[model samples]
Target: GLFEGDKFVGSFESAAMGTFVIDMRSYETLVNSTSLDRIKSYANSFNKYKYYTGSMGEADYRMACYAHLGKALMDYSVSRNDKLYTPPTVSVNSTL
Candidate 1:
């Protein structure tokens, strides 16, 4: 679970029902319309992959959600003149 202050903003789970869920109601009062829209957009984009045939495991799903959520939060923080955390880049060395 992720928290803003004492508020539970979102969480990632590997249950049978779904992989990730965002508590939009919890953060509605914390951010502006633009931030909310971006967050919603990110969540919506995952719909197509929900039932993807080549789906990765639960850990992969959770990481995807984490990336989107982190970006959305960073955008929100910037709007409020706050310092943001930048994610590290991953370099894959594949031998085919």
Candidate 2:
């Protein structure tokens, strides 16, 4: 939808969480809203690093993919529903 003018840019990798950083932009009247600014702020904050966890160590391929997807989903949902725009409330309660 970004190419269709929905304001979304693209996705990158998150070094800390081993996930893809989903990029979203704003172009409507709500462009000045805090939510929009927050998105930009996060994008800026994340872009500071050039490499992700994959480049840090020899992590298991399957495990890395799983972790990356998990973090991506968590971030995606949080961006859409959370009121404070905080990170996802991940629950590692179950046995892995």
Candidate 3:
């Protein structure tokens, strides 16, 4: 049934037209309305992670996320004074 809001705009006479012109303005509306933009990436990658949460599992992907996070934290800590020690202050009453 070809619908034009509330009225039927098409009819099948079975004697004249064989092909109906389908206006997909509404079809495309609901068909492609759930597409989420690429958000996760390790190096600006925008590929669909079908296996990240689907199919078998995302062990590697999940590990990769935390692995990169800890790796970055380790890098930040190691780049700073990772092994430095604090100095003690000396203030004696009879200091020379």
My TM-score estimates for the predictions, one after another, are 0.32, 0.25, 0.24
What order do you get sorting by lDDT, best first?
1, 2, 3
Tens digits of per-residue lDDT, candidate 2, 1-96, equal 223354333222222233223433222222333234444444453422224443333343333433443344346546653222222223234436
Candidate 1 per-residue C-alpha lDDT over 1-87 given as tens digits, one digit per residue, 9 for 90 to 100: 345577534332211122222334433532343355555555564544444445455666555554445454545445643333222
Give stretches of model 2 more than 4 Å off.
1-59, 81-96
Q: List the residue pairs that clash in candidate 1.
A: none
Which model scores highest in TM-score? 1
* TM value for model 1: 0.32
lDDT at 90, model 2: 35
Q: What is the lDDT of candidate 1?
A: 0.42
Q: Predict model 2's lDDT versus the native.
A: 0.34
Question: What is the alpha-carbon lDDT of model 3 when measured against the actual structure?
Answer: 0.29
Tens-digit lDDT track for model 3 on 1-96? Answer: 445675324322210122222224322221233211111122132133322333323454443333332232233334542221111122235438
Candidate 2 Cα deviation (angstroms), residue 76: 0.8
Local distance difference test, per candidate? 0.42, 0.34, 0.29
Better of 2 and 3 by TM-score: 2
